[PDB]
Subunit: 494 residues, 4 copies
């Protein structure tokens, strides 16, 4: 039930978005954005830098001034605008899905049925929160009346990755806007197109000038300018652990702005012996291969109980070999190309590193096409905890299958990691599922499923996977300041 | 680890408690309270009636007047008082436990380790809620500041049963006092002693006069006087569905006061084929026989899958035969006498009715001693849905074991009842437990356990088992009035 | 900014709505509905009775069966449906507003700008709550995992009055539907039209058959049939205190169903001497006269401090005399006719009762036109607390102005009432506002404003003004059952 | 009602506290702690460093291990322990108050009546939260059961200042312990005594070894070691903005641990023309001079409306001159000495800087005694926003009085600051109070009062005054990790 795509969608937006107007970079420079499926340049995009970020923050701050349309606006109206934006996105669903595929490389079918669906649900869910995040009236001691107001944080800098251009944008705009904040967004240089188009819809939706500003550009330039800005009240980052540290330090060095980090992981997918074989195999495959493996919480560590190891591995390899790689606009395509050349090589490097360390290559392991950044679905057997491919996030179609004996054993092994973004357990036993879900040190533990995100459920990590949460009511906390007002009263009564 | 009990505790309180003072009934009348273990009169107790309830309500209302000590007192101080009450009760724990056994009949060991333990945990749990039940500040449209205050409901009438005199008292006083209400409590004529002694501890703890008033007496007299009183703002009742209807009608006929009912049930205990046999049998036994079967949520309908039916029944019968019946003060005693003669006969009648309808009597079925109201642990096999013993709450040590085939089948049969207080499921399968816990129409669904009450978890029923909840944060809603204050402000900003 | 109305809107729906189908009464009877502005019959409408209510409940019950489309539907989707209904109402906004005026009598402008605007905001508000009313995971003692599910209460009987036909409908449908209940609604015989038209839109919106059933008819027949029905789980009533008692008794006499009552009031509007005179006079006028005085929380007791009494009264009288009474479809019209002849006489009766008691008639006091049920804006001065016009709810354009000296005095006088729905205070002083908003025993206290309802702020009364609340998060509590599931786990850890 | 103090309290604890044991620093070094009233050394205290912090973190990590006594302990029991700690502190109340005064210098009367009272209230408040911080069950789309668990963050490093030794300790221990975290606390070198004694009480209360570890020592050594430790999950700091930046950078450079900062401020105290003169003067005086001005939210910028400026200044100067300075153990002493020599000089420097810049010295301005660090209550009039004493936090008994004309003016001037911890308004006007409380950019806005802290009300700052909040339910968020468990179920139903 998917409409025919325009395999060559036209690009209308490729500049810097500030105050609902399109501007060229102050430097006039532009950078190209590549179609990962062909390696060809799609178009030129304004290259924002420090001076462009400065103009954006200034517009954002002005839109956030006391008495401004955005600040005076009824909370319920913010919800109306979010719902309107959702409607416009649904109107241009087919176009956006195609553009997403063109710039990112993910299958159009998935782009339409998954990405945009979730974008719509995210925006619609948050529209509903706009006028429901209450403060409190507190029964403090003495003759006083005390209450709290949940005010917006202010100017929020949002730096998003390229794996889910639209979804990441929505996960950030949703809570930020619902709570009345203003945004300065820096989209990934590899996939700036869709987000820039949405900025056009944000204008058509009626959001006041300066409430949302998007600055396309490079990380060390535009991104760092945001993180170090003296007038940015908060910076939300989603990407590598490496850059996540840079952000945190730039924040402490500047104005002590709030910082939430959504880093990657080496998510353990534990398959117990009593698990439904058919389901576990299909889900473990999805768990890793989803979105060309370019998933922050990809199940890149598939722990399988010894009794079912051989059979599991056999089925997984068969499924991996049957995974159709090709043109993302083709309906049969299950896996498209990787985002860019840099990731293309980085992943080939990890594949090589895997063979070198003793991991048993069961299938794939090389380039899947001469044109574009396509990689064959790769699976490694008999992986060990000490191996590089079992410690570092590959972010590609490379599966690692480890073997284990006891449930107490797998707990320690799955937990022995610097990451803790997600985890999964497949079993039919009640006690085992409860034991594991509690023992596993991950922000999200799936039972007999994987990658089940609800706009309603919080998503974040433990340890070096980041701090703070996104989605659900918890996503609102990070975009809110608590002000307490305590008033002296004549005589307090219960 | 249980101290030696005074098998003949002295009684210090046996009058009406109003304004922290002991009074005789206006009529001067007194009624006897019996020791169910010997059938002997323990002592005389003031027989409160309408004129006494009138005095109590008057006292309560005065203590609730704006500006009074109780109304002005800091919420955190109410918590202090509840904690103080808990301390006093722990001080006299050994005494109270013995007095409880003397008047109620339950084993002293259970009285000490279970009842009083839960009373202490309940009072201490609620003590902590006293200053944490917040109102809200609401983001209403327009230039207004809107907020809510959670105010006490007022004079609360509390009519409690005899199965757990102390615990029932605590379950009512806890949320009511934490929220700042005043109480006029009517304790069961069969077990007024412990509650009256606690009233003395309430005065010792420092609660202002009139905050808690206890009127011992009969139901149709004192109880009905409370339910129909024009100045009682709320009545919480716990007992038979029969009287529960009288209470609700009395409330609609008077001042439209709030009403919460905690009626009995015919709670289904579903044992799946893959359940841990040893655990299931022990828990199913506990599920019904606990407190001489005098438990509102007793598992009086033990549904067992056909594959394990015969084995289950065998073990259950063995366990029932081994259940020690005798002097409640004896450490070996597992089951004491029933509360009184009326219940004694009522149970014997149901046992008789069971034989006559075709239910297979597997053990017991008659009187267990010539002195006291002791009944043999009875078990009925091959029970059918249409039988009386499978529809009406016996409230005695009489177990009903039914057989079933499919999971879809047992859902419908377990749900086919006018009651819906509790239910339980024993299984090792994840999907089965979740399917059942969701499909079962009961206020509380236990999985692989039974009678697991936390002072922190809500407890109430569906359908004709009552309305409203007790325990947990939900218990507070029933004792709170929501007042909304909407103020016009110069200019609203987020 | 109001579109031209069709002063003679066509009626498309005038039958009983069950299972998304239009049916005639089983009896085949019909009753006429009158246009209060002309006294002429608009059309004939199906006259539902017990038999029709029975059919409605059965349909509702079927739509609520486990596994049904409405029960399985994603919570987010129920919100989608409510938003769709809101869009349909907005589409037909001009028509509905005209039809509301035709049947009820309130000015078209008000119907368009106020009633319909509020209905859209109400449904859109609740659409957002659909997937955000979370249950809890409770940290109970022992090795257990305890949580709560907020389930729909079931089949909800909703009986609504005629003062605000559409808004009352929305206030009931919103929370009920967002929480997944099914409804059997009984609309007022004086104003059944708009609600029946909305049932058509409910069908067009996609709501499953039986989710919403409307049975137009009389109270003693259809209404009583719902209140006494054995299969209705909850009954929500809004109307006279007289009938509210009937409903509560009918509920306790039947199945112990849940009951929430939204009864009237004799709301105090207190004007302190330091209030802004211009604003207080305009607001007090609106507080009472709004909607032909046919408002449950009308400020029918305007208490004015002695120092500004003469001046206030003078301005109030002038404003009352200048209030334009006439054809509700005329833009200049501020006051339309009263709903029907019965109310017309009832008010004439109170006006006379006022004169007889000694209250000073300052203006109006008689019929305002020979056609329709128009009454002159009436104002009584120097009213006393003992007078009947100061104790009973007139529900008409009859203002009562009382004089007072101190703030301690007015508190006692404003509180001395069987009603406690709302109250207001006009003052510039912080301490006075806080003192009174705390002291006043009313479910809603407005400071320097009146009739400020937010779809997000709770609305209900104290004492004999009812139990339970509507609007805001609190409105969801009444349409929800709390199920507690407590699971045994291997070993609990924090 | 204050017991007679031991002006020379014994010191029982002066070492490093790890695993409920007292240890000397690994280096064996010790630093002296001075009595600011006499300048004499009280005693020697173990000088902890990196190696000591290492040992503390290890013990804390061990106590936090899955299956440990602290991890398995009932949430309600954590509350019992906190309540037992409070009891022990109350038992030793007079001793602790004396010790607090000896080491810090604040008046014994204040230490006893204010500090210790608040410590008890804080611990008792949080004891109540131990088992009431619920997770949620979320209505996610699809056939899934999704819920959240609120888990402890882990090993929390807590670095506290010297202005409120005991209170700051309780403010940190309360929420951290209530939520089941383990602590490694670094107390200020100027005031380590009281906290160390409390550690002894923590052992006596029954807290498992390793749950609380206190390491006295210097900042750049022990403090930095905690902030940069690889195994510390969270660091909460309270002190200078200067060090607060060091902490945040140390965290981003290490393990991306969570960071909450409680920095100082230059809190504006606005006195409107209509304020109660007597009350405003007394509160403004309290606002600034309290605790020798060593208060993070000291009202160091007293803005006064021009119409009442002269009278206000006059009264304030009179009140400052009558403030009794002297031996803190004397009942008549209102002001004790400053914490240490460094602060003593820093303050004198600001005083001098004040005179140099043109501020009008109205009283004091010099040393108040030859012995001890006493400074005279100083007041500066006609202060200007540009002046150093109007921008930098003095932290001493030095008041700045500024003049203003309009309410719109004062908001901008009050907001024009790097800080935003607190603020206050004195007015009798409702609209003014609401306008200001909303407009002021501060974490806490007081109306007609100052320094009103409730264990129940959140406390934190805006901008460079820090991030995160303390006290109230909000204090728990910082010490909790949210884990989401999403389980696949057979068929989801509402
Ligand atoms: N606002 C407050 O709550 C508050 C309280 C006390 C002091 N202060 C500020 O502190 C100023 C001067 O006193 P101070 O310098 O001793 O306070 P500070 O902020 O430096 O001291 C607070 C805590 O930080 C620790 N610390 C110091 N340097 C550290 C470092 N490099 N890394 C990690 N931890 C370190 C200290 O040992 C102490 O335990 C005061 O004038 C005021 O500005 C503020
Ligand atoms: N008619 C009544 N009106 C009010 N309360 C009653 C009435 N009858 C009994 N009660 C009270 O209800 C509580 C529980 O008793 P009930 O449910 O009637 O069990 P029983 O009467 O079989 O002992 C006791 O306080 C009892 O006195
Ligand atoms: Na200061």
């Amino acid at each position: 039930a998917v409409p025919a795509p325009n395999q060559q969608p036209e690009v209308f937006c490729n500049q810097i978005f500030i105050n609902n107007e399109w501007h060229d970079a102050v430097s006039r420079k532009t950078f190209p954005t590549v179609n990962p499926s062909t390696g060809e340049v799609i178009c030129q995009v304004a290259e924002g830098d420090k001076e462009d970020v400065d103009k954006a923050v200034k517009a954002a701050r002005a839109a956030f001034q006391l008495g401004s349309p955005w600040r005076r606006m009824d909370a319920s109206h913010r919800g109306r605008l979010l719902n309107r934006l959702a409607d416009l996105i649904e109107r241009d669903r087919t176009y956006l899905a195609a553009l997403e595929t063109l710039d990112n490389g993910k299958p159009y079918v998935i782009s339409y049925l998954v990405d945009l669906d979730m974008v719509l649900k995210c925006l619609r869910y948050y529209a509903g929160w706009a006028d429901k995040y209450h403060g409190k009236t507190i029964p403090i001691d003495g003759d006083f009346f005390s209450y709290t107001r949940h005010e917006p944080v202010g100017v929020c800098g949002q730096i998003i990755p390229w794996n889910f251009p639209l979804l990441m944008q929505a996960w950030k705009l949703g809570p930020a806007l619902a709570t009345g904040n203003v945004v300065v967004m820096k989209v990934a240089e590899q996939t700036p197109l869709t987000a820039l188009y949405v900025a056009n819809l944000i204008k058509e939706a009626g959001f006041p000038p300066g409430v949302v500003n998007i600055v396309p550009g490079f990380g060390p330039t535009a991104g760092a300018a945001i993180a170090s800005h003296e007038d940015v009240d908060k910076v939300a980052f989603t990407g590598s652990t490496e850059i996540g540290r840079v952000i945190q330090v730039a924040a402490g060095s500047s104005n002590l702005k709030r910082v939430t980090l959504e880093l990657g992981g080496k998510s353990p997918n534990i398959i117990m012996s009593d698990a439904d074989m058919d389901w576990a195999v299909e889900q473990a495959h999805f768990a890793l291969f989803f979105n060309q493996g370019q998933c922050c919480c990809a199940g890149s560590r598939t722990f399988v109980q010894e009794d079912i190891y051989d059979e599991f591995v056999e089925r997984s390899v068969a499924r991996a070999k049957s995974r159709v790689v090709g043109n993302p606009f083709d309906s049969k395509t299950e896996q498209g190309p990787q985002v860019d050349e840099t990731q293309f090589k980085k992943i080939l490097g990890y594949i090589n590193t895997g063979k070198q360390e003793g991991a048993k290559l069961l299938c794939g392991g090389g380039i899947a096409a001469d044109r574009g950044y396509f990689i064959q679905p790769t699976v490694f057997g008999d992986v060990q905890d000490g191996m590089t491919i079992a410690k570092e996030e590959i972010f590609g179609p490379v599966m690692q299958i480890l073997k284990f004996k006891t449930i107490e054993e797998v707990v320690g092994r799955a937990n022995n990691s610097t990451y803790g973004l997600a985890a999964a357990v497949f079993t039919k036993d009640l006690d085992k599922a409860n034991y594991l879900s509690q023992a596993l040190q991950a922000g999200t533990v799936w039972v007999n499923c994987y990658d089940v995100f609800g706009a309603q459920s919080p998503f974040g990590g433990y340890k070096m996977s980041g701090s703070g949460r996104e989605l659900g009511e918890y996503g609102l906390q990070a975009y809110t300041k608590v002000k307490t007002v305590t008033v002296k009263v004549p005589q307090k009564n219960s």
